[PDB]
Design an enzyme around this catalytic site. Structure first.
Site, PDB file in Angstrom:
ATOM      1  N   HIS A  90       0.859  -1.217   0.000  1.00  0.00           N
ATOM      2  CA  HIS A  90       0.000   0.000   0.000  1.00  0.00           C
ATOM      3  C   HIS A  90       0.886   1.255   0.000  1.00  0.00           C
ATOM      4  O   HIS A  90       0.337   2.361  -0.174  1.00  0.00           O
ATOM      5  CB  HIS A  90      -1.059  -0.052   1.117  1.00  0.00           C
ATOM      6  CG  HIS A  90      -0.596   0.371   2.472  1.00  0.00           C
ATOM      7  ND1 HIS A  90      -0.767  -0.427   3.585  1.00  0.00           N
ATOM      8  CD2 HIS A  90      -0.008   1.505   2.907  1.00  0.00           C
ATOM      9  CE1 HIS A  90      -0.290   0.189   4.645  1.00  0.00           C
ATOM     10  NE2 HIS A  90       0.179   1.378   4.256  1.00  0.00           N
ATOM     11  N   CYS A 105       3.170   1.821   9.515  1.00  0.00           N
ATOM     12  CA  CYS A 105       3.051   0.630   8.639  1.00  0.00           C
ATOM     13  C   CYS A 105       4.454   0.132   8.254  1.00  0.00           C
ATOM     14  O   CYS A 105       5.371   0.930   8.113  1.00  0.00           O
ATOM     15  CB  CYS A 105       2.161   0.885   7.433  1.00  0.00           C
ATOM     16  SG  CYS A 105       0.474   1.360   7.912  1.00  0.00           S
ATOM     17  N   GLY A 122       2.147   6.310   9.642  1.00  0.00           N
ATOM     18  CA  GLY A 122       3.586   6.181   9.358  1.00  0.00           C
ATOM     19  C   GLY A 122       4.203   4.937   9.977  1.00  0.00           C
ATOM     20  O   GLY A 122       5.384   4.670   9.637  1.00  0.00           O
TER      21      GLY A 122
HETATM   22  C1  LIG Z   1      -9.747   2.513   9.990  1.00  0.00           C
HETATM   23  C2  LIG Z   1     -10.183   1.993   8.625  1.00  0.00           C
HETATM   24  O1  LIG Z   1     -10.874   2.660   7.940  1.00  0.00           O
HETATM   25  N1  LIG Z   1      -9.728   0.686   8.180  1.00  0.00           N
HETATM   26  C3  LIG Z   1     -10.083   0.141   6.883  1.00  0.00           C
HETATM   27  C4  LIG Z   1      -8.791  -0.307   6.197  1.00  0.00           C
HETATM   28  C5  LIG Z   1      -7.802   0.826   5.877  1.00  0.00           C
HETATM   29  C6  LIG Z   1      -7.998   2.184   6.071  1.00  0.00           C
HETATM   30  N2  LIG Z   1      -6.906   2.827   5.680  1.00  0.00           N
HETATM   31  C7  LIG Z   1      -5.972   1.945   5.222  1.00  0.00           C
HETATM   32  C8  LIG Z   1      -4.664   2.142   4.706  1.00  0.00           C
HETATM   33  C9  LIG Z   1      -3.910   1.043   4.303  1.00  0.00           C
HETATM   34  C10 LIG Z   1      -4.441  -0.247   4.410  1.00  0.00           C
HETATM   35  F1  LIG Z   1      -3.709  -1.328   4.018  1.00  0.00           F
HETATM   36  C11 LIG Z   1      -5.728  -0.435   4.913  1.00  0.00           C
HETATM   37  C12 LIG Z   1      -6.503   0.681   5.327  1.00  0.00           C
END
Ligand SMILES: CC(=O)NCCc1c[nH]c2ccc(F)cc12
Ligand SMILES: CC(=O)NCCc1c[nH]c2ccc(F)cc12
Lengths: 304, 304
Positions: free
Chosen positions: A41, A145, A143
């Site tokens: 991502h 991740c 940040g």
């Molecule tokens: C809190 C919420 O909405 N979670 C749903 C998943 C999600 C939201 N933002 C992201 C960014 C990267 C990723 F891999 C997954 C997610």
């Protein structure tokens, strides 16, 4: 004496953390040998996250689009591939601090240390468990991740987790280092709900053993039980079923303390039914389930 | 989101840990520049520990009686001195991994990370607080003495604790890195009792702020209080008195959450008087007091 929620020493993992930037997105990567592992991502705009087609987004990316920084030195990316939900970035320099390492996929109830990082820089270390619903309850800001979960066997780091996302409920989901999510989660900004977060029974029992070893004995009762009777009570209290495999695993703690596993089960049963009545066990007002039997033995025996 | 009991990354301290042997006694030392710091009781037989005269026991010790091992390489001791309850061993080699460092004497309520070591080898890291009775509640087996407590400000390790002993109650006592005990404790195997282990009020308040920031709001009440009214309730519940200095320290968390410090005090007051009623705050059934305001800001803002 004393019993603490204890992480592995993090130095060996600190030496592996890098910053990965793709466009405006910066997160963490793990540099082992000449490969940097990071969440795929990293290629997404938060616009992309709503419904990403990773293969299609990747076509628009070259080696030079992935900026990898280790300390304040740039690594040269000479290759990139997607494996499940992680990117592998081939760099021209083997990490000189690469430890002995393995990639392991852990089972629910297994504990591990997380080195929380921002911009490839370690901020903290804490102990987690893989929850029975394949979430973890971490501490992860924007940040973080690509922060990784690990165990250490003497000098070998077993990497088991890479951080990818928060669920709307504020619990955490990620992959093993082959990029496969724990549980049914996907790297997409879509409402995903966790299943029941059940208590890791075998871990609670390990921690009750830890408590007896450290002189906290008030909850030891005059009863025993059977796996079937205990499990009826477990089910009712959203505890994982106890198997004979769990009983076998607890055998050394049983031996050390002279408390039969089924006796400790009967003590746990009464704790569930009666509550703590305002008392504490190892400084906790609730039954701790993020120590494994192996963790209790390690900490109570002093392995390094 | 999520809030974890988080230690500093330990790598910088891992690179400082050595094994110190004097006769049959092995414990841990801290190697900074060309000095190894360790508990002076390294010179004692457990017979000596009952009533040691350290100056007299030291006369029987030469440089060559102190065996210092860093990994599996021996360091040459070229000097030794006693400073309060620590030995400083001058070695002929500066630690190549010496980080930027300070020695600080912390106040009660201050938190720090401990790298638990055995035979100069790190086994784990955990977060502690200096208790108001100048004990810490650690996890320390035989051989863990000389394990150190520390904070990190970016790249500077502030060493604040060295482990020396367990009290008969299984709580822990040690020194700063100038060898001065926290509290009234002495390095002698004589029954020593801790005073009241009071709750670190300012830290509980910090952690309630952390809970609001992470969406745990059920305990927020419709009341406010005054420092004097709150303190009457604090005293009754073996909580440390709250000062205006504590209120000042909480100001940023107040601002971030829009909850006046005295309002959060009134919420804490009701939690003391009413209990948790089987509810949890940040996964705890008791009020956590081993996060400082600084710790909550750091973890909630993601400092590295
Ligand atoms: C809190 C919420 O909405 N979670 C749903 C998943 C999600 C939201 N933002 C992201 C960014 C990267 C990723 F891999 C997954 C997610
Ligand atoms: C549990 C208990 O008896 N604590 C009294 C102090 C004590 C005992 N053994 C020691 C070894 C070294 C040291 F510095 C202090 C002690």
């Amino acid at each position: 004496s004393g019993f603490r929620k204890m992480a592995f020493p993090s130095g060996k993992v600190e030496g592996c953390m890098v910053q990965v930037t793709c466009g405006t997105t910066t997160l963490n990567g793990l540099w082992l040998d000449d490969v940097v592992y990071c969440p795929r991502h990293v290629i997404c705009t938060s616009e992309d996250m709503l419904n990403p087609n990773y293969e299609d987004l990747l076509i628009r990316k070259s080696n030079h689009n992935f900026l990898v920084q280790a300390g304040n030195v740039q690594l040269r990316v000479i290759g990139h591939s997607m494996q499940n939900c992680v990117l592998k970035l081939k760099v021209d320099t083997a990490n000189p601090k690469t430890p002995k390492y393995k990639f392991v996929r852990i089972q629910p109830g297994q504990t591990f240390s997380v080195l929380a990082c921002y911009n490839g820089s370690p901020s903290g270390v804490y102990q987690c468990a893989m929850r029975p619903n394949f979430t973890i309850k971490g501490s992860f800001l924007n940040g973080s991740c690509g922060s990784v979960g690990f165990n250490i066997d003497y000098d070998c780091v077993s990497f088991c987790y890479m951080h990818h996302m928060e669920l709307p409920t504020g619990v955490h989901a990620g992959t093993d280092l082959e990029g496969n999510f724990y549980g049914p989660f996907v790297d997409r900004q879509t409402a995903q709900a966790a299943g029941t977060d059940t208590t890791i029974t075998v871990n609670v029992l390990a921690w009750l053993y830890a408590a007896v070893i450290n002189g906290d004995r008030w909850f030891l009762n005059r009863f025993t039980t059977t796996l079937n009777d205990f499990n009826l009570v477990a089910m009712k209290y959203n505890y994982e079923p106890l198997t004979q495999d769990h009983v076998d695993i607890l055998g050394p703690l049983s031996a050390q303390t002279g408390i039969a596993v089924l006796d400790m089960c009967a003590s746990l049963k009464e704790l569930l039914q009666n509550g703590m009545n305002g008392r504490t066990i190892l400084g906790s007002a609730l039954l701790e389930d993020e120590f494994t039997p192996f963790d209790v033995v390690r900490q109570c025996s002093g392995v390094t």
